[PDB]
Every structure is written in C-alpha cells, then in structure tokens.
C-alpha cells in the first residue's frame, strides 16, 4: 500500500522507471562495461552457450526496461546479478572480463543504493 515502506518487493511504477533507466545508462557508459554491453558473441567463445544456461547482458536489460518487464526491484537486481555471476562462472578470476565484473558490480551497488534512497510511492 501507499502507507507501507519501500522495499525490493514494492511494485515498480512508470515513475520508478526514470530511476531504473538512469542506473542502467550509468552502467552502459562505464568504461569497464564493454564485456557486458551486448550478448556474448559465440565466435568469441564457442563453448559459451553450452555452459551458461541463462545468458544476460545490458542490451537485453535495456530492451526489458523499455518493455516495463520488471514488476519489482528484485527482478531487475536478479537480471543484473546474472550478468556478473555468469561472467564469474565462465571465466577465471584473472580474466579481464572477470575484473570488469568486479568493478561494475560494486558500481551497480553504489548506484542502486542511490536509487533506493531516492524512492517514494
Ligand atoms: C574479447 O572481446 C569481447 C569479449 C566479450 C565477452 C564477455 N563476457 C562477459 C564473457 O564472459 C566472454 C566469454 C566474452 C568473450 C564481450 C565483448 C568483447 C568485445 N568484442 C570482441 C569481438 N567480438 C566480435 C565483438 C565483441 C567488445 C570487445
């Protein structure tokens, strides 16, 4: 209800998408976001799609944001987390992609905390 506190389960409104779009754009503009901007190209990693069952990337999240796919903030955070978890599953810790996931994930958490602090019904 309008009287209850905001949480990760609060239904997202059209208004909340202004902040989600801002957060997503900030990730897309980060210099270390290059491994995640688009789906992994099978030619760059021929075994990838036989290992990673649920791929995710920032362009797919942008499409989902445009379609208002996310009903609760938990679902948005889950897709973002899948990007980084897939990266850390598939790649060794010394991979440049893994290093990009470590910086971009804590940047996402910084931005998400700001989104949450600013949110009202
Ligand atoms: C080696 O460069 C990349 C690697 C990945 C990648 C990302 N993530 C998360 C992975 O887990 C794996 C396994 C990979 C391979 C993404 C993009 C590129 C870039 N392009 C290379 C040439 N290609 C034709 C277009 C993309 C942008 C430099």
CSV table of C-alpha atoms and ligand atoms in Angstrom, one decimal:
chain,number,residue,atom,x,y,z
A,1,UNK,CA,0.0,0.0,0.0
A,2,UNK,CA,0.9,3.7,-0.2
A,3,UNK,CA,1.5,3.7,3.6
A,4,UNK,CA,4.0,0.8,3.6
A,5,UNK,CA,7.7,1.3,3.5
A,6,UNK,CA,9.6,0.9,0.2
A,7,UNK,CA,11.3,-2.4,-0.3
A,8,UNK,CA,12.8,-4.6,-3.1
A,9,UNK,CA,9.3,-6.1,-3.4
A,10,UNK,CA,7.3,-2.9,-3.8
A,11,UNK,CA,5.6,-2.9,-7.2
A,12,UNK,CA,7.5,-0.7,-9.7
A,13,UNK,CA,5.6,2.1,-11.3
A,14,UNK,CA,6.2,4.0,-14.5
A,15,UNK,CA,7.7,6.7,-12.3
A,16,UNK,CA,10.3,4.3,-10.9
A,17,UNK,CA,11.5,3.5,-14.4
A,18,UNK,CA,13.0,7.1,-14.6
A,19,UNK,CA,15.5,6.0,-11.9
A,20,UNK,CA,16.0,2.4,-13.3
A,21,UNK,CA,16.8,3.9,-16.8
A,22,UNK,CA,19.3,6.3,-15.2
A,23,UNK,CA,21.0,3.4,-13.3
A,24,UNK,CA,21.2,1.3,-16.4
A,25,UNK,CA,22.5,4.1,-18.6
A,26,UNK,CA,25.3,4.8,-16.0
A,27,UNK,CA,26.4,1.2,-16.2
A,28,UNK,CA,26.3,1.3,-20.0
A,29,UNK,CA,28.5,4.4,-20.0
A,30,UNK,CA,31.1,3.0,-17.6
A,31,UNK,CA,34.5,2.3,-19.2
A,32,UNK,CA,34.6,-1.2,-17.7
A,33,UNK,CA,31.2,-2.2,-19.1
A,34,UNK,CA,32.5,-3.3,-22.5
A,35,UNK,CA,32.3,-7.1,-21.8
A,36,UNK,CA,28.6,-6.7,-20.9
A,37,UNK,CA,27.0,-4.3,-23.4
A,38,UNK,CA,25.8,-6.9,-25.8
A,39,UNK,CA,25.2,-10.7,-25.6
A,40,UNK,CA,28.3,-12.7,-25.8
A,41,UNK,CA,29.2,-13.4,-29.4
A,42,UNK,CA,29.6,-17.2,-29.9
A,43,UNK,CA,32.6,-16.6,-32.2
A,44,UNK,CA,34.5,-15.0,-29.3
A,45,UNK,CA,33.7,-18.1,-27.1
A,46,UNK,CA,32.4,-21.1,-29.0
A,47,UNK,CA,31.7,-23.1,-25.9
A,48,UNK,CA,29.9,-20.3,-24.0
A,49,UNK,CA,26.2,-21.1,-24.7
A,50,UNK,CA,26.8,-24.8,-23.9
A,51,UNK,CA,28.0,-23.8,-20.4
A,52,UNK,CA,25.9,-20.7,-19.4
A,53,UNK,CA,22.3,-21.7,-19.3
A,54,UNK,CA,20.7,-18.2,-18.7
A,55,UNK,CA,22.8,-15.6,-20.5
A,56,UNK,CA,22.2,-11.9,-19.7
A,57,UNK,CA,23.6,-8.6,-20.9
A,58,UNK,CA,23.0,-4.9,-20.6
A,59,UNK,CA,21.3,-4.5,-24.1
A,60,UNK,CA,18.8,-7.3,-23.1
A,61,UNK,CA,18.2,-5.4,-19.9
A,62,UNK,CA,17.6,-2.2,-21.8
A,63,UNK,CA,15.0,-3.9,-24.0
A,64,UNK,CA,13.3,-5.3,-20.9
A,65,UNK,CA,13.4,-1.8,-19.3
A,66,UNK,CA,11.8,-0.3,-22.4
A,67,UNK,CA,9.0,-3.0,-22.2
A,68,UNK,CA,8.5,-2.4,-18.5
A,69,UNK,CA,9.3,-6.1,-17.9
A,70,UNK,CA,10.4,-5.7,-14.3
A,71,UNK,CA,7.5,-5.7,-11.8
A,72,UNK,CA,9.6,-5.5,-8.6
A,73,UNK,CA,13.1,-4.2,-8.0
A,74,UNK,CA,14.1,-7.8,-7.0
A,75,UNK,CA,13.7,-8.9,-10.7
A,76,UNK,CA,15.9,-6.0,-12.0
A,77,UNK,CA,18.6,-6.8,-9.5
A,78,UNK,CA,18.3,-10.5,-10.4
A,79,UNK,CA,19.0,-9.9,-14.1
A,80,UNK,CA,21.9,-7.6,-13.3
A,81,UNK,CA,23.4,-10.1,-10.9
A,82,UNK,CA,23.1,-12.9,-13.5
A,83,UNK,CA,25.4,-10.9,-15.8
A,84,UNK,CA,28.1,-10.8,-13.2
A,85,UNK,CA,27.5,-14.4,-11.9
A,86,UNK,CA,27.7,-15.8,-15.5
A,87,UNK,CA,30.9,-13.9,-16.0
A,88,UNK,CA,32.5,-15.3,-12.8
A,89,UNK,CA,31.3,-18.8,-13.6
A,90,UNK,CA,32.6,-19.0,-17.1
A,91,UNK,CA,35.8,-17.1,-16.8
A,92,UNK,CA,38.8,-17.5,-14.5
A,93,UNK,CA,39.5,-14.8,-11.8
A,94,UNK,CA,42.4,-13.4,-13.8
A,95,UNK,CA,40.3,-12.8,-16.9
A,96,UNK,CA,39.8,-9.1,-18.0
A,97,UNK,CA,36.1,-9.9,-18.1
A,98,UNK,CA,36.1,-11.1,-14.5
A,99,UNK,CA,38.0,-8.0,-13.4
A,100,UNK,CA,35.3,-5.9,-15.2
A,101,UNK,CA,32.6,-7.7,-13.4
A,102,UNK,CA,34.2,-6.9,-10.0
A,103,UNK,CA,34.3,-3.2,-10.7
A,104,UNK,CA,31.0,-2.9,-12.5
A,105,UNK,CA,29.1,-4.9,-9.8
A,106,UNK,CA,30.2,-2.6,-6.9
A,107,UNK,CA,29.4,0.4,-9.2
A,108,UNK,CA,25.9,-1.1,-9.7
A,109,UNK,CA,25.6,-1.5,-5.9
A,110,UNK,CA,26.6,2.2,-5.4
A,111,UNK,CA,24.0,3.3,-7.9
A,112,UNK,CA,21.3,1.0,-6.7
A,113,UNK,CA,21.7,2.4,-3.1
A,114,UNK,CA,21.2,5.9,-4.5
A,115,UNK,CA,18.1,4.7,-6.4
A,116,UNK,CA,16.7,3.1,-3.2
A,117,UNK,CA,17.4,6.2,-1.1
A,118,UNK,CA,15.6,8.5,-3.5
A,119,UNK,CA,12.5,6.2,-4.0
A,120,UNK,CA,8.9,7.2,-2.7
A,121,UNK,CA,5.4,5.8,-3.6
B,1,LIG,C1,37.1,-10.3,-26.5
B,1,LIG,O1,36.2,-9.2,-26.5
B,1,LIG,C2,35.0,-9.3,-26.0
B,1,LIG,C3,34.6,-10.3,-25.1
B,1,LIG,C4,33.3,-10.4,-24.6
B,1,LIG,C5,33.0,-11.4,-23.6
B,1,LIG,C6,32.3,-11.0,-22.5
B,1,LIG,N1,31.9,-11.9,-21.5
B,1,LIG,C7,31.2,-11.4,-20.3
B,1,LIG,C8,32.3,-13.2,-21.4
B,1,LIG,O2,32.0,-13.9,-20.5
B,1,LIG,C9,33.0,-13.7,-22.6
B,1,LIG,C10,33.4,-15.1,-22.6
B,1,LIG,C11,33.4,-12.8,-23.7
B,1,LIG,C12,34.0,-13.3,-24.9
B,1,LIG,C13,32.4,-9.4,-24.9
B,1,LIG,C14,32.8,-8.4,-25.8
B,1,LIG,C15,34.0,-8.3,-26.4
B,1,LIG,C16,34.4,-7.3,-27.4
B,1,LIG,N2,34.2,-7.7,-28.8
B,1,LIG,C17,35.1,-8.7,-29.3
B,1,LIG,C18,35.0,-9.1,-30.7
B,1,LIG,N3,33.6,-9.5,-31.0
B,1,LIG,C19,33.4,-9.9,-32.4
B,1,LIG,C20,32.6,-8.5,-30.6
B,1,LIG,C21,32.8,-8.2,-29.1
B,1,LIG,C22,34.0,-5.8,-27.1
B,1,LIG,C23,35.4,-6.2,-27.1
